[model samples]
Target: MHDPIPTIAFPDGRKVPALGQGTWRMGENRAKTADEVRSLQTGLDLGMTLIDTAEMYGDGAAERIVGEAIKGRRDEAFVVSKVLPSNASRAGTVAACERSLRNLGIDCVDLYLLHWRGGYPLAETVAAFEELKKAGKIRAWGVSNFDVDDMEELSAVPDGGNVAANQVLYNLARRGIEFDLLPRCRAQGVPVMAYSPLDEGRLLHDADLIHIAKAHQATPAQVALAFLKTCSGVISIPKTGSPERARENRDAMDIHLTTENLAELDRHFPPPRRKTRLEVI
Candidate 1:
């Protein structure tokens, strides 16, 4: 049996596993559908129940795969999906959420996010999110790819403080958020959801990560994930198509890093010292 995965709470008191699953390109290939579904199912079984997907991913194909994976077990999964900014207008946002709900085959999305800031005004999108929450289409709403300035603008709008989470590209290689956006969200009780926590597999072979993993008897990838745990109120969703890899991701949460390990990582991938451009995938 595996130890229960650690969890972080939203401002609203909803707790989700700190290490969850991501589906960035899972449903792009029909031939790999079953494999992708199994990967998510394996994650669910291992307590990585917070699954993040997007309507933009494979044009809603990923949501369908998520629906299949959580079939008859929907209650066990905390589903998070995003609405494209292009479709985030007042009426469009509502309609987009309807379409996403249909795609996921669920009545309510646990968390809905504005994929990123687009041409449409933030007020229109925030109003739309408030509407979705009122209509019971989404339990909570948030934004992705939003930096400190974007978040400040969101807070100034009506009902924007209801923002639940901010999903962004964060990994050992991308420490820009460490300077500002991260602490800003933490102070507001908004949990930051980290996408691409493994840096899309780019950090797995880094000399620093390799050396740290050796000291912990874990894989470099696991070391990369465990490092995120040192930060409070941060959630990492690492995507994998193989069930074995999904299990590996789940087990990474159990790896404990010492002060020296963190210091070594800091020395190599130093945190941001000033306001930097928020990196997006």
Candidate 2:
């Protein structure tokens, strides 16, 4: 029997597939449109219903492609699209979400997220999200690249609105969230959606990670992804256009990392550096 993809229920009672197909670099101009479409279809056929896209992804071309791919099969997927910082205002957010809906050929998105935190007034953005949720244009609301403070601020918005999840760069080498963002999210029962769970190919060459892979008879990528899955309230979305790689990534769900292996990987790569003024998002 095929293993089931884990899911987390939102506060609104909607379940989201734990593992999603991230459509970042995949929607670039160099990526063949036909191949991108195939990738989307393949991901869905493999039971990956959560598809994440952004307005800035390929200058909005990604959403259009996702729209085309999910045409007849839209209801079968839990789709997510983001509003960029420049479009964080109420009117802009609503307009952008509507545009994404039109591009995806859907009436409403399963989840809508603010692409960045603190780039705009939290009150204003949350207001827009609530409006969309009320209007039935978005099923759930979330944020991407937000920190502990940002989440706390938004969570207290007086309207009883809470973020369902926060998408962030998470991998064996990137564990910054483990300290603050993660713990806070867990305390609040907010799911953490991990982006770059494979470190954009960086984990493949890590000798330490490779050692753990050998012990489990798994690939380095699997070892990395499995590590993230070990954390509570964590969901990983590793982007891969190749069907072979996609299957391999999906298999990662079956690989479990032991405490000892987790420690070893952490020692070797360590958590990501803190954000400095120059690194501010």
Candidate 3:
């Protein structure tokens, strides 16, 4: 039985599940492709339909895997893909998006993001995103790895106000965004897409998290996700290549962390108190 996962809204009011699947390293291995695809299909069946991938991920291999996974169930998935900052130029962004679209065997991506700020000017990338929006290549566009200053700079650019979300590396171990970027995004109505919520399994064995997990008879990864679920406007995308793990990740949405559990987590993984550089994978 699946419980309803809360939705996080974009600036324009469109919503996606707070818990979604990530495809960072899914397409790298040829022999494991079937298992990976099955895992994603399982996630979709379990209501974790928002899939995040990037053109840089295995050099577009991940997008292709995503394509295979959602072949007949395309409409059931809220597909998100990224254009590399190296491809962030106005024309280059459009071209990269088209390439990604082709890789995914789709005409349009629900959300496309500039993977990170590169040498290209934010204006050019934002303009490219606007152009793509007009062309119906992407329903909406945003950025990744943008720090507080970068976000402020974006806001000054024309059409930057239209940014819908900021996908960044955030987890209990990497709480740097809590200092400013997250609060800024929240105030501006931009949802923060949290990548690697379990710190890529680093936080799974932490004594404090384990303590809390035991209280709920859950895994530490689930506790980590449950913690993120408590944060408003934050969506967590945890990657897995096992169908059982995908199911486990989906079940994390059903966990309810007690106030005491939250307090203990804070004591272990304290929130940021000062501005710091945004951490990226």
Q: Please state the error at residue 238 of candidate 1 in Å.
A: 0.2
Clash count of each predicted structure:
0, 0, 0
TM-score of 1: 0.97
Predicted candidate 3 versus true structure: per-residue lDDT over 1-281, tens digit per residue: 66799998898888888999999888878899999999999998888879999998898899999999999999999999999888889889989999999999999999999888889889999999999999999999998998888898899999989999999999999999998888889998899999999999999989999988888998999989999999998999999798999988988888888888888889999998888888988
Deviation (Å) of 20 in candidate 3: 0.7
lDDT of 1: 0.91
lDDT of 2 by residue, 159-276 (tens): 5356778888777767777667777777777788888888788679988888889999989988887787677687788885667777877788888677787778768977655642
**In candidate 2, which residue ranges exceed 4 Å CA deviation?**
270-281
User: What TM-score fits each model?
Assistant: 0.97, 0.90, 0.98
The better candidate by TM-score, 2 or 3, is 3
Candidate 1 deviant stretches above 4 angstroms: none
Per-residue accuracy of model 1 over 1-281 as CA lDDT, tens digit each: 56677789998898988889999998988999999999999999888899999999989899999999999999999999998988989999898898889989999999999999999989999898888888888999999999888998888988888899999999999999988899888998999999999899899879999998888889999999999877788999899788999988887888889888888899999988899999999
lDDT of each: 0.91, 0.80, 0.91
What's the best-to-worst order under lDDT? 3, 1, 2
Sort by TM-score, best first: what order?
3, 1, 2
